[PDB]
Amino acid sequence: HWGYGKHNGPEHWHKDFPIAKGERQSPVDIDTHTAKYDPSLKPLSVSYDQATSLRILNNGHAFNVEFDDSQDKAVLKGGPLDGTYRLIQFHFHWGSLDGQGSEHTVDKKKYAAELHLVHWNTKYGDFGKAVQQPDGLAVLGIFLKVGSAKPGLQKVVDVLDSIKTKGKSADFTNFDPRGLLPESLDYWTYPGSRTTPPLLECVTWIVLKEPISVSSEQVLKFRKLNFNGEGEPEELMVDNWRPAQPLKNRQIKASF
Template sequence: MQLLFSLALLLFLTLTAEAGDWCYQSQFTCDHQCKTPNLWNNADSDCAGRFQSPINVVTRKTLPDERLTAFKFSDYQKIFSGSIKNNGHSVQVQIPHGSTISGGGLSTTYKAVQFHLHWGARGGPGSEHTIDGEQYPMELHIVHMKHRYTDLNTALKDPEGVAVLGFFYEKSNSANRKYDPIISSLQSITEANKTTSMKPVSLTQLIPAEQNLTSYYRYKGSLTTPGCTESVVWTLFESPIPLSSDQLKAFSDLKFHDGKPMVDTFRPVQPLNNRQVFRSSTTAVIASAAVLVVALVAALGMSHLN
């Protein structure tokens, strides 16, 4: 009887462990039948929600929103020393709470908590969000929570408790030396759960110049890994970050928990389910202004001819 009880307990613990054993499609094998993205709802029921992320942004269906003004980045230029970790499904860097964002149509100030990345295989397509079906090589997520919260779990209970800034990467012919602190650290954290010190860095050096951050998309969504909590205000910037082919490939040298190459670390795009995606109106305004100037110049020219 005691043996049967022990076997039953072992089976229960195994099933319970497997319920949380989520993985990316690239990790699934006959020997490791983990829960791939289409089964994440078995790892966490919230992953079957109606407002999931990532999504494909269809630009012609986005609506301009005059409230989506320029962001105010506070202490983003502040240099900090920290550690970078291979957490088994990405690389993650914790951020001191001094850096904040406001404006940009946000309801309040949000403080930076951490950033992590999602990528493909050897520099191939790997971003989570797509723009008109285009998948970029990699995507950066800078995770923020409302300034009044002290931990991310509490913030996730607020329907708008978390704000994530998403940035795309593009291949360039030359290396982006601003990323040396991150790239040079990767060889020390190839194994899962490895952590190493990172050379001093600032958030400002990792993202496009502030004057290039006025064109972006906005929608309500979720975390892109289990538990898929639908408490995220998403901002996706149009201006991409350049990295060389070798820099992009360096991320594929990392390994998952099972020792397999850490590649294709993205969740497939999710149904929009009647959500509206908004866009900042800066680009449209600039374009309209340019057209107006051309028209005025032409009109003045015609008047001189007459």
């Protein structure tokens, strides 16, 4: 099955998922001089005071922190979106080295990691129906750079030993996602897709301009996770990022 290796990496995905070469594929390189400042872009509204985390799980390609999305507890609105979007999960993409790890690039600059807060359009009623619409999903992309430790991220780092292999899960309540947001909400936006198979084209991307800093030891813990299940040969969960894809006419707008 699909993965990030030489025999099943991103270059091979198109064979099982033909949309890999579609018209609105993600991630992309954000060219800062070609991006369009759009004065009609409303400021993003992040309402996460009521977020309820439930668990953390190693799904084999990343680790997901899941939230209860049966009510409008943690939502995204404003910016380029129309309607309310509920936070369902968050995950990261990181590299083997500090020089790589992000999926999106800025003027070709690669960051150490990239956080994705996934949300789905409430008029569709469930996440499953959402992935059947062109505006089904909204993903907030936050860049991580290595520097000082991010206090807000440590509870996450500390639970990683418990879900080291694929399929492992752990209760993870009372986690507040607010602790992972940069100071400014200025962003770039474009129409795109999920970055892992099925690569469905239903995502409105909101990429934050300011990165968050994490310490070297924080990122180190991410790299200790395994792609494999318990009892299998160890494969370190590193470089689970997809390369930049062709913009193909699409326009990247800026909120600034």
